[PDB]
């Protein structure tokens, strides 16, 4: 019996790049041209792209012409493509043909979240409100669960640049970034300078200053 | 080339002759394949070239037509066979579909009994509040869930589900959850759950007052 | 001068297969012999594989051998990869030579969070307290946030299938599955019986029972 | 085939000449390329068969060696070139990397000043608790943070971010993030943060009760 497999999907977000590839069982591609379907949640089926024998050719669909791209290889018998929110489909690897000159794969699940951009959360990292005597404190500014980098953070807009460490950023188990942006200054300074911290992100065009501050 | 399918959702009983019309925009000869797909399955070749029976799938079934018409044919339905069926216009080297057919098993417009559920306080507790949307056993299969949390109109934070045609009844049943945290959930009083469908004569609204 | 460029790279989960593909600027593959290469956490390289001339060979490091698989486009000039936790690294698409007979790309991310599977959590869509006059009511188990497919929903363990609809599992925008498991029965014995959902969960080896009684 | 280098951390100043061993298990004639990374930059070639010298590449540098032994010299440091550095037995169809050598500014031994911020509520608010441990300032780069929330030992559920070498001190700062719902950060009182350190005689404990 022939068969044919999909591997590679998952969740993407919106602009984004994921890549499938197709396994095959029993036959060789070589002599075929190979074709992508997607099927949409209309229940609609599309047809996404084909390559001929000898990769004489490839045909994309219009709505795709252009961010995607097939590939096979007719030695180890695999198809690939590269890569919306009208993207998100099931997508069968597929085989034209006969008998005499037909066969698919069970499809792979392909989803792309709208958000291209989202902003980043500011919260303060307080030093403390007992403070005094005359001591170091650290005090600065959490920014959390944006996408994607980067993330510039300032202290007072230009001014305050010593002492200061800005982490690098870390990829959370969900896939969305977080920084901590930290500054040395006097124990003794916590409650005249006062601290504001700039988290300018250029790509969701969003700026959020946040006062930083003993609770 | 562009092919339309009709009808979009045919109904008819066990043991039916039925059919389905496929067109394409210009003259495509003989080449156009038949294709059934049972839900998150492959799909299943069945008619190539108009009219030629693809080894392996039984008598009942039948094509023709050339030029720009076409006609897909079963005879003698079985449960085996409700499922959905494409159309294709296969070339050398693209191709093209139809919008679909899906074959359901007819009964009466049967309306949504409509419940709501809130959100318990063992997940109240946890940071989020799951409020949920059911649609017990109705026919045909298209109907509309619009959330109103406070009386405004939500787009887009909630997600559904549709049950097959119950092995017993032919209805349908949609299930259409609403999610929210915790700290967007005890912001609003009144969450308003209001579906549309054939068999009510108006939009059917079903609330709860937080807490 | 010379360019190599990767994408395809995010979060995969244990045992997870993802596709990684090298597209190129400036030159030809087709003569090279292409190599992919990852940075593990302890700063160490690593090369994964390589991919020969005409493809006359394909070379696997051992850690790898056997989930993995490279394969190269020599007429649009792109290769390829094919898919644990010490997987989790940077990946590299390299070309092996010389100016006579060297260049890199900027590398991916590549990560593999540590769960193969997710028990999934049980809790009471409890009846409408509206209730009254011999009617119908609606009850359930909301079965939330479990991976992977499937989760069979069977009601007081084999004795009330009627009226019962085990809905479609949906994919949240987190990538964790969702539900609902519901059954229509009188309002009138809402009461004496009790109602009991049993959510096996065949893949992380999961079975929780939930008591679906009042508010 | 195994490539070990030697040393792991190499310490040195500007102007410095300093060198690295890389050794093979096995008789590697002169096949063997050295490479310079900076983080998250591609790596770049240096130097191929034991000792010629890649074209684009200033002449402060240096390889040798053949059979299982060889040797790279770096020839008065500079800024550019504080960095990691790899070697690399590349055969016909596969290839093995030493575990690296990472050069750093070489400084004095200071220890972690130890700091700890707890999780605000402004987020305490939305069902997340955040809790922060900074080792502020410290050399060399080896220091290890283990949490400890009601004197339990946690593992897994924190998450590191270290500086490079600050421009000016040579010194290192540790960012160590603890994150829990907002529903298992209210089960517990004490939240303990435990740093191990070379210049430490002991290690350094920073906690809060909550609230």
């Known amino acids: 019996e022939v068969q044919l497999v999909e591997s590679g999907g998952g969740l993407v977000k919106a602009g984004g790049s994921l890549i499938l590839s197709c396994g095959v069982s029993n036959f060789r591609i070589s002599a075929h041209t190979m074709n992508w379907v997607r099927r949409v949640p209309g229940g609609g089926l599309e047809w996404?792209?084909?390559?001929?024998?000898?990769?004489?050719?490839?045909?994309?669909?219009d709505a795709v012409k252009g961010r995607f791209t097939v590939s096979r290889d007719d030695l180890e018998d695999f198809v690939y493509l590269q890569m919306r929110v009208e993207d998100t489909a099931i997508?069968?690897?597929?085989?034209?043909?006969?008998?005499?000159?037909?066969?698919?794969?069970?499809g792979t699940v392909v989803t792309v979240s709208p958000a291209s951009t989202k902003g980043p959360s500011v919260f303060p990292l307080a030093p403390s409100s007992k403070s005094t005597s005359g001591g170091t404190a650290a005090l600065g500014c959490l920014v959390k669960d944006y996408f994607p980098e980067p993330v510039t953070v300032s202290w007072n807009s230009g001014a305050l640049t010593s002492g200061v460490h800005t982490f690098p950023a870390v990829l959370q188990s969900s896939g969305l970034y977080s920084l901590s942006s930290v500054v040395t200054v006097p124990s003794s300074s916590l409650g005249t300078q006062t601290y504001i911290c700039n988290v300018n992100h250029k790509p969701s065009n969003t700026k959020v200053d946040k006062k930083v501050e003993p609770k | 080339v562009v092919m339309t399918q009709s009808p979009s959702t045919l109904s008819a009983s066990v043991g039916d002759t039925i059919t389905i019309t496929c067109?394409?925009?210009?003259?495509?000869?003989?080449?156009?394949?038949?294709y059934q797909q049972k839900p998150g399955k492959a799909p299943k070749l069945l008619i190539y070239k108009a009219s030629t029976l693809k080894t392996g799938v039984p008598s009942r079934f039948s094509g023709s037509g050339s030029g720009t018409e076409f006609t897909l044919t079963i005879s003698g339905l079985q449960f085996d066979d409700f499922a959905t069926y494409h159309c294709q216009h296969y070339a050398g080297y693209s191709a093209t579909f139809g919008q679909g057919t899906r074959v359901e098993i007819k009964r009466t417009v049967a309306a949504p009994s409509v419940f709501i559920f809130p959100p318990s306080d063992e997940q109240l507790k946890s940071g989020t509040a799951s409020v949920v949307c059911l649609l017990n056993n109705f026919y045909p299969r298209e109907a509309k869930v619009q959330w109103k949390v406070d009386n405004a109109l939500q787009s887009g934070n909630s997600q559904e589900s549709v049950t097959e045609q119950d092995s017993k009844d032919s209805t349908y049943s949609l299930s259409s959850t609403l999610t929210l945290s915790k700290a967007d959930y005890e912001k609003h009083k009144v969450y308003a759950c209001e579906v549309t469908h054939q068999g009510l004569s108006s939009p059917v609204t079903k609330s709860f007052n937080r807490g | 001068e010379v360019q190599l460029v990767e994408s395809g790279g995010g979060l995969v989960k244990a045992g997870g297969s993802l596709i990684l593909s090298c597209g190129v600027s400036n030159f030809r593959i087709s003569a090279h012999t292409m190599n992919w290469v990852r940075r593990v956490p302890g700063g160490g390289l690593e090369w994964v594989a390589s991919?020969?001339?005409?493809?006359?060979?394909?070379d696997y490091a051992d850690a790898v051998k056997g989930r993995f698989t490279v394969s190269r486009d020599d007429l649009e000039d792109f290769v390829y990869l094919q898919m644990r936790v010490e997987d989790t690294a940077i990946y590299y698409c390299?070309?092996?030579?010389?100016?006579?007979?060297?260049?890199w790309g900027p590398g991916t991310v590549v990560t593999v969070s540590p769960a193969s599977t997710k028990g999934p959590s049980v809790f009471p869509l409890a009846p409408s307290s509206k209730s009254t006059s011999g009617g119908t009511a609606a009850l359930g188990c909301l079965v939330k946030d479990y991976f992977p497919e499937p989760v069979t929903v069977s009601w007081n363990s084999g004795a009330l299938t009627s009226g019962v609809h085990t809905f479609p599992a949906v994919l949240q925008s987190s990538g964790l599955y969702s539900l609902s498991s519901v059954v229509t029965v009188p309002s009138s014995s809402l009461g004496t019986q009790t109602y009991i959902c049993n959510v096996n969960h065949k893949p992380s080896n999961t079975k929780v029972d939930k008591k679906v009684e009042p508010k | 085939v195994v490539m070990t280098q030697s040393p792991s951390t190499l310490s040195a100043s500007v102007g410095d000449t300093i060198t690295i061993t890389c050794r093979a298990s096995?008789?590697?004639?002169?096949?063997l390329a050295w490479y310079q990374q900076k983080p998250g930059k591609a790596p770049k070639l240096l130097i191929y068969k034991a000792s010629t010298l890649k074209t684009g590449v200033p002449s402060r540098f240096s390889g040798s060696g053949s059979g299982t032994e060889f040797t790279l010299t770096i020839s008065g440091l500079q800024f550019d070139d504080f960095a990691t550095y790899h070697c690399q037995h590349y055969a016909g169809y596969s290839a093995t990397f030493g575990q690296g050598t990472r050069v750093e500014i070489k400084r004095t031994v200071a220890a972690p000043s130890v700091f700890i911020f707890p999780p605000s509520d402004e987020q305490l608010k939305s069902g997340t608790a955040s809790v922060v441990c900074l080792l502020n300032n410290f050399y060399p780069r080896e220091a290890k943070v283990q949490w400890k929330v009601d004197n339990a030992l946690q593992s897994g559920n924190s998450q590191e971010s270290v500086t490079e070498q600050d421009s000016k001190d040579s010194t290192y700062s540790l960012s160590s993030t603890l994150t829990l719902s907002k529903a298992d950060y209210e089960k517990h009182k004490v939240y303990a943060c435990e740093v191990t350190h070379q210049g430490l005689s002991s290690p350094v404990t920073k906690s809060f009760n909550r609230g």
């Open positions: 390299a070309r092996k030579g010389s100016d006579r007979l060297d260049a």
């Open positions: 991919i020969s001339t005409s493809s006359t060979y394909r």
């Open positions: 096995q008789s590697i004639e002169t096949w």
